[PDB]
Design a protein around this nucleic acid. Structure first.
Ligand SMILES: [Mg+2]
Ligand SMILES: [Mg+2]
Ligand SMILES: [Mg+2]
Ligand SMILES: [Mg+2]
Ligand SMILES: [Mg+2]
Ligand SMILES: [Mg+2]
Ligand SMILES: [Mg+2]
Ligand SMILES: [Mg+2]
Ligand SMILES: [Mg+2]
Ligand SMILES: [Mg+2]
Ligand SMILES: [Mg+2]
Ligand SMILES: [Mg+2]
Ligand SMILES: [Mg+2]
Ligand SMILES: [Mg+2]
Ligand SMILES: [Mg+2]
Ligand SMILES: [Mg+2]
Ligand SMILES: [Mg+2]
Ligand SMILES: [Mg+2]
Ligand SMILES: [Mg+2]
Ligand SMILES: [Mg+2]
Ligand SMILES: [Mg+2]
Ligand SMILES: [Mg+2]
Ligand SMILES: [Mg+2]
Ligand SMILES: [Mg+2]
Ligand SMILES: [Mg+2]
Ligand SMILES: [Mg+2]
Ligand SMILES: [Mg+2]
Ligand SMILES: [Mg+2]
Lengths: 120, 118, 207, 53, 113
RNA sequence: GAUGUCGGCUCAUCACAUCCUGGGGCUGAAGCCGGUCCCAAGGGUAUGGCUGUUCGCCAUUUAAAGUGGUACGCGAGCUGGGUUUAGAACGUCGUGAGACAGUUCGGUCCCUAUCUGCCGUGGACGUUUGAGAUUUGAGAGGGGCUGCUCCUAGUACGAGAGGACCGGAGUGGACGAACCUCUGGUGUUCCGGUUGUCACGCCAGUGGCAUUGCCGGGUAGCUAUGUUCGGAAAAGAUAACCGCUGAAAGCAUCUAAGCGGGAAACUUGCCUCAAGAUGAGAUCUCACUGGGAACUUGAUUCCCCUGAAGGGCCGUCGAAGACUACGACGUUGAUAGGCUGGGUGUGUAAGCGUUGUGAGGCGUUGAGCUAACCAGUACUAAUGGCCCGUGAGGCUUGACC
RNA sequence: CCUUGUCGGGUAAGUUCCGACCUGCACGAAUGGCGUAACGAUGGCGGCGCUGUCUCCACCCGAGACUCAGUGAAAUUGAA
RNA sequence: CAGGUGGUCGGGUAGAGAAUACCAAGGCGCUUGAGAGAACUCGGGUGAAGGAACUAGGCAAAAUGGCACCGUAACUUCGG
RNA sequence: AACCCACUCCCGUUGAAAAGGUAGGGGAUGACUUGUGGAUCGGAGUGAAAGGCUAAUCAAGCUCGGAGAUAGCUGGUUCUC
């Protein structure tokens, strides 16, 4: 989410209900990860029947956080509750629908799917 | 660091510091001349002057507000009756500070605080 | 050459697109030239520069006569700029007209002084624990050197003291706006020193 | 900690070379001709030709 | 005054009079796909600064069962319009106590009409 | 007649037998990748589960998660988890006291730094008459890191799969500096809510104490989690390496002479200090133009008159500061305090009058109060005072009326 | 002892913890053997909440420390 | 000399209370002060995002804690 | 809660104190706590047992005598040629 061992729920239908960050991908030692940054998570609490089992190492992208996202302005979108979206071995999402809002700072060439699938 | 921070602690807690200037003003408005320490006089001019300025407008609300911070019937009576009318046309500067030697026991720079007209 | 001004706080301006440009407003009095150090008499080549508004009672007679060779009636401080090749008369006026949009510049000036700083603040050291049995030492520096055969403490060791107001320069700040009427420079970024100080603006050589 | 060798007279006296006094801020009152510290009320109670106490 | 005077030129009237506790709707410019468009952000104001050009308010919205609070800069050209739909008495400056209350407990009373 | 032993945290410094980045040779190196070996120490070189553990095995990255020295660095910098004095227990040996480098719980880690060393900051004197200000740079420090996308080009190469060299554009991680414009934190000196209790002759209103009583906010300042910037480009000499002419040795030959290219290393280039650089450097300007005696003669000493340029004392202070030091101002006057208009923070003050039996509500109603923020204003406080610093700047040689 | 013996659970990862295997160097029945509710300032693990423990510390308030005046030790000391 | 020392009286307001917070009677200002408000130590207040990732170990700190009512599991020596 | 005891962190270590202080902690109708007086003493007493306590001293105290014990062990041993 923003640090190793940071509990957060997922924004996905076929995923779990809560996951925990275990590694912030990127440089040598990244202390923090903002919205739109890849993390590595472990499934801590799963839905009674989905697709991802409990206690599995997956890759996720941060989509919401209480720290907020800062644009090229004095204006920041700040949520109340963290969230993430799971990813496959390739960097495309697992589920179909996305719960809650997202941010337009996230949409890049590689994330045109989840932004289109999410109600902002 | 103190960068552009105003107000000196004087090695006293906040309540002692408040109550000490509250009791220095009430004593200054009885005798009109006090032998006090110079750093204490440099801070007393930021407490007595608001009271003297407040005393220039007589009202129930003004007298209550003055009493709320200099709690003494004699001081409130001295204000609004002798002070605030004598300085009815003096813009600011209601008292002066004159350094006076040093203390006998310790070496504390003393200073006289005196009302400007007396 | 360069221009001497005053830091006067930071502000912000909004362009038509929508982005925010943090800005440091630099006041620039029109600067007079005091000397033109030629090579034949001084070796190097440079030009003196001065700001105004100093009372006559605070200038020594030596300085008053120094500002009498060129009719300047100069004020506080004297600054000198080394230049490659450009002629300047004894009495000249240097304004903000030599700057334009873009034009990344180097901004020097005395930084804000911290009184007497510890090692965690001056050198970004890491502190010891706070609960796990630790003794009084919580923020003090740890070891200094090795046991037997440095025989001493190596010079240049990072220790506490005086995060000072020593001169520091921020490199390659782009100018957003130049005001030839109010005599202002809008620099995109931070400027060393507190507001109301003295700041030197020079073209950036690093590019 | 403690010392390994005592300091001699020269080493001790060199340290206290920067230990001297200076209070020469005296001024003569124009009226009473009384010596007093500058910007201070005189011992008799005069400041720049005016009794204040 | 030189910095207080530069800000006056950037100040152009864009906002009506409002206060904390109102339910404003904000039209924000969206630059995406080489086509500019507006977007409506309706919520309840919970904070305000009045420094001048450095003025900003915070508006809280509940979207898709998820809360979200957006800090807006008053004099940015991104903040195009600002209309007040409701105003109520709160006798407080910052309504940060609403970050916990969700539904019926987070209702703004009405002594002001 | 005492050198405190293993691990952990903090702080680092040094070697290259180099993990990554950099330049090259060979290869059973088509390309993408690799193996091996020279040159290269400029900068980097991970977070966790276990275990007291260094080490080691694991899950997940990263360009890489280097090997050693430095009392297997660092306890007059911290811990005492291990070994570990006294208590107790399990197993084994011993009839027994007791023992085990076999296990398990519990078990006081002292020192105010005198002299070297280092980070800061001052006083004295010198730089040859004395001052104000600016300065060249002998020399020493600072920095040097790197990933990921797009165009060249799906081109070359390769049956196909797969896929560049060099060059250009963009934005990321770690590190470092600076600053509050923004986003937050703090803000016991600003404004409000409210519990218990005491007090102001009582109602109202208000103030102490209860961790700021408990909180809701918050100006300036400080601050990072925020804003911006930097690692270079370019030149010279080179290491490994690639050579051209060229013999010795009619050919050949990168060398013996000579002429080149050549990498984060070297020296400039970017930033800071820097003439105590006793070799004490350099330009501009300012100040002093009076006598007498003894003794000796760069002539020395003494008496009087003179004290200039300026500096210090002192005071009002500073986004400067431990004390200093440094910057600004002292009535030729806005240096500090106050006062009047503003802005900000808080939120319809007290009192007047009505509805209700009453708490409460209503014109009162954006009111009142408002620290450090901006403008103006001599009302107050900074005294036409004292002390230092002098009276034309030694002698030899060359040019020079 | 070999030993972090082999299998399973918990965790992404478990020389610690819990349940089994018997190859018990060196368990074993009043130096008592197996169980045991409640009791432990007892030992070892795991979970919710909580948080400056920690990424990484930033600000603020008092008593120290620093300057002025008075009184005024200490261990050590062959000489510098 | 922040330590130790047997026994009686022991009020008002809240509170079950000889606890706790303010006061009456009565007694005290704790026998060096005055400055400034650096590092660092000690005793505290708050904290953006994470929430034990710190550590030999949740050590220390943070959080719950009052009266009335509802309701309460494995196990048990049938009290809990 | 008084009262007794001393489980944990920090401070203190030349301390306010030769064993304490601010925070937290256990018992608090009993095998309790405590005031006054008395009995048990040196290879000898007491001990819910640590080799603990026996006047700041304990694997057998303090003091006076044997005693200037003994020390194959340290240290020191003074003017000149
Ligand atoms: Mg209080
Ligand atoms: Mg400063
Ligand atoms: Mg501590
Ligand atoms: Mg040591
Ligand atoms: Mg040596
Ligand atoms: Mg609600
Ligand atoms: Mg010895
Ligand atoms: Mg090598
Ligand atoms: Mg280089
Ligand atoms: Mg060692
Ligand atoms: Mg120690
Ligand atoms: Mg034992
Ligand atoms: Mg009342
Ligand atoms: Mg009282
Ligand atoms: Mg010179
Ligand atoms: Mg003069
Ligand atoms: Mg038994
Ligand atoms: Mg009572
Ligand atoms: Mg926090
Ligand atoms: Mg929070
Ligand atoms: Mg751990
Ligand atoms: Mg760890
Ligand atoms: Mg605890
Ligand atoms: Mg007792
Ligand atoms: Mg108790
Ligand atoms: Mg004893
Ligand atoms: Mg003997
Ligand atoms: Mg005998």
């Amino acid at each position: 989410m923003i640090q190793t061992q940071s509990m957060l729920d997922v924004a996905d239908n076929s995923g779990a209900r809560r996951v925990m960050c275990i590694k912030v991908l990127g440089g040598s030692h990244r202390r923090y990860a903002g919205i739109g940054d890849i993390i590595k998570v472990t499934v801590k609490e799963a839905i009674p029947r989905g697709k991802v089992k409990k206690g599995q190492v997956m890759t996720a992208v941060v989509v919401r956080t209480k720290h907020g996202v800062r644009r090229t302005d004095g204006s920041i979108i700040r949520f109340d509750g963290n969230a993430a979206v799971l990813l496959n071995n390739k960097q495309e999402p697992i589920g179909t629908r996305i719960f809650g809002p997202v941010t337009r700072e996230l949409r890049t060439e590689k994330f045109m799917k989840i932004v289109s699938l999410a109600p902002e | 660091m103190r960068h552009r921070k105003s107000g000196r602690h004087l090695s006293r807690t906040s309540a002692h510091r408040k109550a000490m200037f509250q009791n220095m003003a009430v004593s200054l408005f009885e005798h009109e001349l006090i032998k006090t320490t110079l750093p204490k006089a440099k801070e007393l001019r930021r407490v007595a002057e608001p009271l003297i300025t407040l005393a220039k407008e007589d009202s129930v609300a003004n007298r209550r507000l003055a009493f709320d911070r200099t709690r003494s019937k004699a001081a409130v009576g001295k204000l609004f009756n002798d002070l605030g009318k004598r300085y009815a046309n003096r813009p600011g500067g209601y008292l002066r500070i004159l350094k006076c030697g040093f203390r006998a026991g310790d070496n504390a720079p003393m200073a006289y605080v005196e009302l400007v007209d007396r | 050459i360069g221009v001497v001004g005053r830091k006067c706080g930071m502000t912000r301006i909004f362009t038509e697109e929508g982005v925010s440009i943090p800005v440091t407003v630099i006041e620039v009095e029109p600067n007079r030239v005091t000397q033109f150090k030629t090579e034949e008499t001084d070796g190097y080549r440079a030009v003196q520069v001065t700001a105004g508004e100093r009372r006559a009672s605070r200038v020594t007679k030596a300085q008053a006569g120094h500002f009498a060779k060129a009719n300047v009636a100069a004020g506080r401080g004297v600054w000198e700029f080394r230049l490659g090749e450009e002629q300047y008369a004894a009495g000249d006026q240097i304004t903000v007209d030599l700057f334009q949009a873009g034009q990344m510049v180097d901004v020097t000036g005395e930084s804000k002084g911290k009184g007497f700083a510890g090692t965690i603040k001056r050198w970004n050291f890491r502190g010891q624990d706070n609960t796990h049995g630790n003794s009084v030492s919580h923020r003090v520096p740890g070891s200094i050197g090795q046991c037997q055969t440095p025989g001493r403490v190596f010079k240049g060791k990072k220790m506490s003291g005086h995060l000072g107001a020593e001169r520091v320069t921020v490199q390659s700040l782009e100018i957003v706006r130049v005001d030839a009427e109010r005599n202002l420079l809008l620099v995109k970024g931070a400027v060393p020193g507190a507001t109301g100080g003295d700041v030197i603006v020079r073209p950036a050589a690093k590019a | 900690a403690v010392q390994q060798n005592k300091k001699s007279r020269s080493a001790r006296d060199m340290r206290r070379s920067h230990d001297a006094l200076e209070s020469n801020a005296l001024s003569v009152e124009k009226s009473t001709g009384e010596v007093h510290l500058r910007h201070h009320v005189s011992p008799d109670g005069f400041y720049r030709g005016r009794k204040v106490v | 005054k030189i910095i207080q005077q530069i800000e006056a030129e950037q100040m152009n009237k864009e906002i009506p009079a409002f206060a904390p506790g109102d339910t404003v709707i904000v039209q924000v410019k969206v630059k995406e796909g080489d086509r500019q468009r507006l977007q409506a952000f309706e919520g309840v104001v919970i904070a305000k600064r009045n420094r001048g050009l450095n003025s900003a308010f915070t508006v809280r919205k509940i979207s898709n069962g998820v809360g979200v609070e957006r800090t807006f800069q008053t004099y940015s050209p991104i903040v195009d319009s600002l209309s007040v739909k409701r105003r109520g008495d709160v006798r407080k400056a910052k309504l940060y106590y609403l970050r916990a209350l969700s539904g019926k407990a987070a209702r703004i009373k009405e002594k002001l009409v």
